[PDB]
Enzyme design. Sequence first.
Site, mmCIF file in Angstrom:
data_model
loop_
_atom_site.group_PDB
_atom_site.id
_atom_site.type_symbol
_atom_site.label_atom_id
_atom_site.label_comp_id
_atom_site.label_asym_id
_atom_site.label_seq_id
_atom_site.Cartn_x
_atom_site.Cartn_y
_atom_site.Cartn_z
ATOM 1 N N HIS A 96 0.877 -1.172 -0.017
ATOM 2 C CA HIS A 96 -0.092 0.098 0.026
ATOM 3 C C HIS A 96 0.853 1.428 0.084
ATOM 4 C CE1 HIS A 96 -4.428 0.864 1.063
ATOM 5 N NE2 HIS A 96 -4.162 1.416 -0.090
ATOM 6 N N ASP A 119 -9.813 -0.685 4.569
ATOM 7 C CA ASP A 119 -8.794 -1.297 4.995
ATOM 8 C C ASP A 119 -8.792 -1.609 6.289
ATOM 9 O OD1 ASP A 119 -5.958 -1.793 5.674
ATOM 10 O OD2 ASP A 119 -5.309 -0.180 4.267
ATOM 11 N N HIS A 121 -6.558 -1.078 8.358
ATOM 12 C CA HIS A 121 -5.647 -0.224 8.992
ATOM 13 C C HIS A 121 -6.075 1.166 8.274
ATOM 14 C CE1 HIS A 121 -4.011 -4.181 8.578
ATOM 15 N NE2 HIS A 121 -3.758 -3.998 9.809
ATOM 16 N N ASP A 123 -3.489 3.290 8.041
ATOM 17 C CA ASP A 123 -1.964 3.602 7.014
ATOM 18 C C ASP A 123 -1.589 5.042 7.355
ATOM 19 O OD1 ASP A 123 -2.251 1.217 6.465
ATOM 20 O OD2 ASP A 123 -2.816 1.287 4.468
ATOM 21 N N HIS A 136 4.240 1.138 4.211
ATOM 22 C CA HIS A 136 3.100 0.915 3.423
ATOM 23 C C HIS A 136 1.862 1.077 4.686
ATOM 24 C CE1 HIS A 136 2.318 -3.562 5.512
ATOM 25 N NE2 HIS A 136 2.961 -2.730 6.056
ATOM 26 N N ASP A 227 -7.294 -2.083 0.107
ATOM 27 C CA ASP A 227 -6.419 -2.930 0.861
ATOM 28 C C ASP A 227 -7.245 -4.241 1.019
ATOM 29 O OD1 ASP A 227 -4.798 -4.490 2.530
ATOM 30 O OD2 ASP A 227 -4.094 -2.821 3.823
ATOM 31 N N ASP A 229 -6.973 -6.741 2.791
ATOM 32 C CA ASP A 229 -6.944 -7.068 4.114
ATOM 33 C C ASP A 229 -8.006 -6.256 4.685
ATOM 34 O OD1 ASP A 229 -4.218 -5.382 5.527
ATOM 35 O OD2 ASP A 229 -5.996 -4.510 5.242
ATOM 36 N N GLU A 272 -1.953 -4.987 -1.348
ATOM 37 C CA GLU A 272 -1.502 -5.920 -0.560
ATOM 38 C C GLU A 272 -1.797 -7.407 -0.723
ATOM 39 O OE1 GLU A 272 0.433 -5.441 1.526
ATOM 40 O OE2 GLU A 272 0.409 -3.296 1.841
HETATM 41 N N1 LIG Z 1 0.084 -0.063 11.372
HETATM 42 C C1 LIG Z 1 1.139 -1.222 11.454
HETATM 43 C C2 LIG Z 1 0.363 -2.198 10.073
HETATM 44 C C3 LIG Z 1 0.570 -1.596 8.652
HETATM 45 C C4 LIG Z 1 -0.404 -2.170 7.711
HETATM 46 C C5 LIG Z 1 -0.092 -1.343 6.334
HETATM 47 B B1 LIG Z 1 -1.300 -1.951 5.323
HETATM 48 O O1 LIG Z 1 -2.781 -1.400 5.613
HETATM 49 O O2 LIG Z 1 -0.950 -1.351 3.982
HETATM 50 O O3 LIG Z 1 -1.134 -3.324 5.029
HETATM 51 C C6 LIG Z 1 2.135 -0.418 10.871
HETATM 52 O O4 LIG Z 1 2.068 0.923 10.933
HETATM 53 O O5 LIG Z 1 3.209 -0.885 10.588
HETATM 54 MN MN LIG Z 2 -3.116 -0.826 3.771
HETATM 55 MN MN LIG Z 3 -4.115 -2.715 5.860
#
Ligand SMILES: N[C@@H](CCCC[B-](O)(O)O)C(=O)O
Ligand SMILES: [Mn+2]
Ligand SMILES: [Mn+2]
Lengths: 314, 314, 314
Positions: A96, A119, A121, A123, A136, A227, A229, A272
């Site tokens: 991402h 998502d 998260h 991000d 990401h 995303d 996930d 992702e």
């Molecule tokens: N919040 C965690 C997980 C990151 C997840 C990122 B994603 O949504 O792009 O898979 C981090 O800042 O490392």
């Molecule tokens: Mn993401």
């Molecule tokens: Mn995510």
Amino acid sequence: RTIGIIGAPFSKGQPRGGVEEGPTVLRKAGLLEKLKEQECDVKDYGDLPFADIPNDSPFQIVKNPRSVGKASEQLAGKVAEVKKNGRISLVLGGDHSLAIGSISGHARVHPDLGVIWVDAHTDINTPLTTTSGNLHGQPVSFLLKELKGKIPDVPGFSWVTPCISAKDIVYIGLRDVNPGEHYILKTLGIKYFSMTEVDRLGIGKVMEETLSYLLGRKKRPIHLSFDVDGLDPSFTPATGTPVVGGLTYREGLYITEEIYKTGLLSGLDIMEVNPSLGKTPEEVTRTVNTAVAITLACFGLAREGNHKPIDYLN
Amino acid sequence: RTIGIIGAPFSKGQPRGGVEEGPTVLRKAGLLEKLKEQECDVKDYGDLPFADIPNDSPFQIVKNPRSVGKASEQLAGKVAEVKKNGRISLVLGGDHSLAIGSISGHARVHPDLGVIWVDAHTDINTPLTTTSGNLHGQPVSFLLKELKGKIPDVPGFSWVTPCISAKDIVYIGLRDVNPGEHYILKTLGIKYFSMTEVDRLGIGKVMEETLSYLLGRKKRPIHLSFDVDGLDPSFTPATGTPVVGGLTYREGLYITEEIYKTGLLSGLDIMEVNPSLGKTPEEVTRTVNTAVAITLACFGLAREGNHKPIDYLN
Amino acid sequence: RTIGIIGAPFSKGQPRGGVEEGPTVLRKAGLLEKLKEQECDVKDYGDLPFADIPNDSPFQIVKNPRSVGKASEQLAGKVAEVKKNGRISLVLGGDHSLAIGSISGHARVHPDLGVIWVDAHTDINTPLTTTSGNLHGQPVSFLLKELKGKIPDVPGFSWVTPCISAKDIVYIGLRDVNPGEHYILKTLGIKYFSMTEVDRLGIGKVMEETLSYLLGRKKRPIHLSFDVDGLDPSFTPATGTPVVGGLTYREGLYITEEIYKTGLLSGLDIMEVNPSLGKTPEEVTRTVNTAVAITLACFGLAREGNHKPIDYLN
Ligand SMILES: N[C@@H](CCCC[B-](O)(O)O)C(=O)O
Ligand SMILES: [Mn+2]
Ligand SMILES: [Mn+2]
Ligand SMILES: N[C@@H](CCCC[B-](O)(O)O)C(=O)O
Ligand SMILES: N[C@@H](CCCC[B-](O)(O)O)C(=O)O
Ligand SMILES: [Mn+2]
Ligand SMILES: [Mn+2]
Ligand SMILES: [Mn+2]
Ligand SMILES: [Mn+2]
């Protein structure tokens, strides 16, 4: 609708490399063929050739900064090139972090775009609030104008100029938000529908409010950064950061079906997907198939059915 | 919030003994550690040492009556002791028969409490309507004032004095209600939201009505007795009486998140977790992990995120 | 309620023969025994002995036409015979082509009936729009009066006389509708709630509208044709044409519980159960058990519980 497919096989926004196999497995699943099977005009802009940057040490805690800032720099120009061609950019990505370039290039041609972020998260970690150092999980922090003056000068991102305001973005599906990120959310007044709001209102209401929130003042181009996930891992298991209790297959399709129906979709990201993380070949096929379905829904495929403007009874 | 953890390794309220391994597996999963990781004040009152009662023949059809009546007698005093300490009692139990002591001890200190019962069953069989003879499916019958004069004098329960009225309790998640139990439900006017009402209204509305029903007249302390089989067995498989078509993980978390937000939670029960019944080690981990999540939600963990009262951008 | 069970072991409406094992596995699961355990009056009309038609070549693209038209001709007379006996016909079938005879025989005795069609598909292909040539995906085209003059004279169906109007039928659960079928849907103004409408409104609202749509003008007998693939394959895997993102177990039970409560149910079809397609013995048991549950819900079994008109506290 008229597409402009862009393959973005990049993964340095996180640890696991199998993510750059996304553009490949999605295409083998017949994505291009299936879009054409619909009222879709498709042009494959190919897979962006990301050159390796051997000398790329961490900026403080931030990993592979130059590699990531370059991949988004390159992507941004492609997305703008496809948007110049009057086509809806479909970025088949790796991690991402590529969203920084995707939204950036799209906003160059359509500065008034709105973002919908599906998502698990947010991000939205900044180089200073991040704890993993993986870019990401920081893409939104680079794009938000309000956070300008809080993002350090990280090697590889000088070309970045925040293009979206905290009020031109909606989050759907949240369930693993860091403390600093949450502080950002409430402080900048970012609109979101975590899994709790989805449970309370239903995805039908969640989509009505999302779309009213972004298009109520005036219609504006829509950017959907998806995303995989965001959906429950029982649907897309082959992804690097799965979180239980996610959006259902049906909810995933509902979200996109509603977006399509706005006729305002102009930029999409399918991110992702990591085949290398599928416990079995079926988990891989389950993840890939779900990603394809969500993609086709963005461009017209309706669960109630589809038919051409002709007389079938003849 | 401020907790008062009480381990209740008891199982004679039903046939399978593996249930007394609950306090143990939940603690190993890091429950105490995770609560402290949140704005939680936690005091472990230890695992209650239930002494074996060798001479405990059935009272008619009722099994292990003295053993069960004693374990709840002992629990009731602990729960009252923790409520005297101005703490929210968290009874990590074995079988649901321990609810008789849990609600009883809680009501001693807070006579005006309200009960929310998440369960696939009503557990309201009397010693005369029960067909299995297992006391874990009869706890409510001992507590309801309206049924006083219908419960026989069972060895081990003389110390019991019904403490809750049929109108101070709500059921959520019902899907396996015996005939006599149903007669009780409609006759005493007990409020409930079976899986059918959840399907019809949605858990969002179900929680709004539940909370209005119990706190509308006036705010009163809340007792949440959670049977993990209230949730679908695809989430908590390691339990003795699973029934398909249960509450989802998300709905489970929604229920508790909403309870927490009332700031009125004062007593909680996490029951029926039996590791010994997990078909595999993962089914055990799935059950334990879900129970921990539900527990953390009762004390603040929010899916949208959590942050301390400080400036994270600094 | 008072039943009239009819076993219809037929499968020539499609390729796979294991479907005629439905009447057998459902009965072994204890369906008759379970109905009697409820306030149900049951009469087993036996399994219809469908005679093989060796000489049955395709009519154009349509396969086993004479065999299919005969099986429905035979079924229609049985259904009418049971409806003459003042009983609710329960057709335990093979493939969905048997619906032509089921609805036809039912309408002979109750011309003003309304149809509720739970299915992943519309099964409204005509002999000319079908692409598979399988008659189980064409039953509605033979029944709709509005399509009369568009259905060719297919060997084995001369006895057919369309009995239902496009406005006396509702579809619930659609997610795999062919182009011609969709054209039919919008052209004849057929009311339906695909998985998208279910996602948007919730099954509670979907059932309220369905029932208002059909019974608002005046109460009329209800015919429920249930294709087990209407439910998600995680519930009924042993079926010939599964489509992901289907109705949940809970939604399945909600639909039927609501139908029962109307007191208007008069004809039911439990179709497409094919044991031979279960990947494992459990998938078979999962499919069979779900079909039985849905069936019992149609006749009274309520998730909130059931009790006789007596005093259980005594
Ligand atoms: N919040 C965690 C997980 C990151 C997840 C990122 B994603 O949504 O792009 O898979 C981090 O800042 O490392
Ligand atoms: Mn993401
Ligand atoms: Mn995510
Ligand atoms: N109603 C059955 C099942 C009891 C279930 C009890 B429980 O909810 O605590 O697990 C019985 O009375 O034995
Ligand atoms: N529409 C496809 C699939 C048929 C499904 C039929 B059914 O619903 O009865 O299983 C066909 O016309 O062949
Ligand atoms: Mn219980
Ligand atoms: Mn229970
Ligand atoms: Mn069908
Ligand atoms: Mn079907």
